[PDB]
Amino acid sequence: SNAMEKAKLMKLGNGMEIPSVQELAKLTLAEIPSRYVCALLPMGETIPVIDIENLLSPEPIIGKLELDRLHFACKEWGFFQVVNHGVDASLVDSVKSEIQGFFNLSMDEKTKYEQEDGDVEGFGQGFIESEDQTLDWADIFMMFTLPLHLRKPHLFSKLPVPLRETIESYSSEMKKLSMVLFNKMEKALQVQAAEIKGMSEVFIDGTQAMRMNYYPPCPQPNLAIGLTSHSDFGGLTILLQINEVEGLQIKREGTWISVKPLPNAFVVNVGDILEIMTNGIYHSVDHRAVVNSTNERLSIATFHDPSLESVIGPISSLITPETPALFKSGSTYGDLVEECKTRKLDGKSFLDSMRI
Numbered sequence: 001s002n003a004m005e006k007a008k009l010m011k012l013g014n015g016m017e018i019p020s021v022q023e024l025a026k027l028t029l030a031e032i033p034s035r036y037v038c039a040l041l042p043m044g045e046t047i048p049v050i051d052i053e054n055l056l057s058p059e060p061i062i063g064k065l066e067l068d069r070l071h072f073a074c075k076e077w078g079f080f081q082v083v084n085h086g087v088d089a090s091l092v093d094s095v096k097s098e099i100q101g102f103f104n105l106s107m108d109e110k111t112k113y114e115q116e117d118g119d120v121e122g123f124g125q126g127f128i129e130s131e132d133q134t135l136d137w138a139d140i141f142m143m144f145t146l147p148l149h150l151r152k153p154h155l156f157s158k159l160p161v162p163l164r165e166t167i168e169s170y171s172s173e174m175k176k177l178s179m180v181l182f183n184k185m186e187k188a189l190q191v192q193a194a195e196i197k198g199m200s201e202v203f204i205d206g207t208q209a210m211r212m213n214y215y216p217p218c219p220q221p222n223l224a225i226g227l228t229s230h231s232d233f234g235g236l237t238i239l240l241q242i243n244e245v246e247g248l249q250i251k252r253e254g255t256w257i258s259v260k261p262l263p264n265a266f267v268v269n270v271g272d273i274l275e276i277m278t279n280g281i282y283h284s285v286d287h288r289a290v291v292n293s294t295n296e297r298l299s300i301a302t303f304h305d306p307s308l309e310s311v312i313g314p315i316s317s318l319i320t321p322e323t324p325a326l327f328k329s330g331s332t333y334g335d336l337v338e339e340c341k342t343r344k345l346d347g348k349s350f351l352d353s354m355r356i
């Protein structure tokens with residue numbers, strides 16, 4: 001791939017668009033550019049598996065055992081796989097093939113959507129902020145998917161039709177599965193939705209977004225990271241690993257644990273806002289995605305978050321003498337999102353900043 005492309009991809013100033021790593025990987029460089037070098041914990045028992053059919057079983061003994069398993073996973077792990085989840089195999093196959101198809105399109109075709117200033121949705125990691133900034137070894141496509149009025153209509157119109165139709169179907173199925181899980185988590189926590197401002201009501205008309213992740217092979221995989229360590233900010237994340245390449249890791253007791261998605265599974269995790277709503281009973285866990293020297297990895301994360309005007313705090317029935325209130329109450333989700341963006345990166349986590 002030509003000398004001009006190398007120059008366009010590597011001669012970067014602050015304020016320029018973050019370049020495509022899928023394009024950079026075509027150069028097959030010996031050494032990665034300095035911006036991709038990180039500047040840690042050892043490697044490690046595997047994440048629990050929750051069966052959705054068992055969870056929804058009309059047989060109370062089956063349902064109760066699976067509820068106990070869900071409750072355990074949310075408390076002790078913050079991450080679990082879901083199987084027998086009711087999302088049609090043919091839909092999942094289409095999500096995989098259409099997203100694979102999409103990233104294999106040319107840059108021109110992937111960036112057809114024209115962003116007005118402050119429109120950050122669609123393809124792209126954003127802009128280079130400083131020489132200090134570390135870039136992830138990944139390209140993304142990220143957009144809001146619910147409610148309907150948060151969809152960028154021109155972005156959706158410029159997607160390939162089968163991808164768009166598949167994404168719209170997948171949005172609905174992800175939303176349904178998220179509500180199955182929120183409803184059972186409510187039941188596990190013994191929150192009566194009628195008497196109490198609970199959990200499910202916050203999410204039923206909440207926001208949904210998708211982040212499609214493309215992690216190209218990297219010649220120096222022990223210097224770079226696919227996706228920098230983070231906890232997800234919102235409610236429930238439902239992740240599909242698109243191909244059979246491993247890379248997701250979670251931070252457990254000061255060590256990184258690999259997650260290997262089962263063939264017909266999604267990986268589900270608790271976000272920071274859900275930790276707050278549960279008064280710290282369920283845990284939002286730090287995780288990252290690592291790259292490798294030989295194979296690209298793809299994934300799609302679907303985030304299920306409160307409405308922007310939802311008032312956030314620990315659910316009052318989870319505040320007890322045995323579990324006193326750990327977190328502040330009373331900010332809207334949208335204000336927490338904004339405050340976190342303009343927060344100090346030096347010092348504490350978002351969660352630790354919300355502690356009473």
Ligand SMILES: O=C(O)CCC(=O)C(=O)O
Nearest residue numbers: 211213247248289299301
């Ligand atoms: O690609 C992965 O396995 C992880 C994705 C992720 O953590 C995210 O999109 O928040």
Ligand code: NA
Nearest residue numbers: 316317319320
């Ligand atoms: Na209480």
Ligand code: NI
Nearest residue numbers: 230231232287
């Ligand atoms: Ni994540």
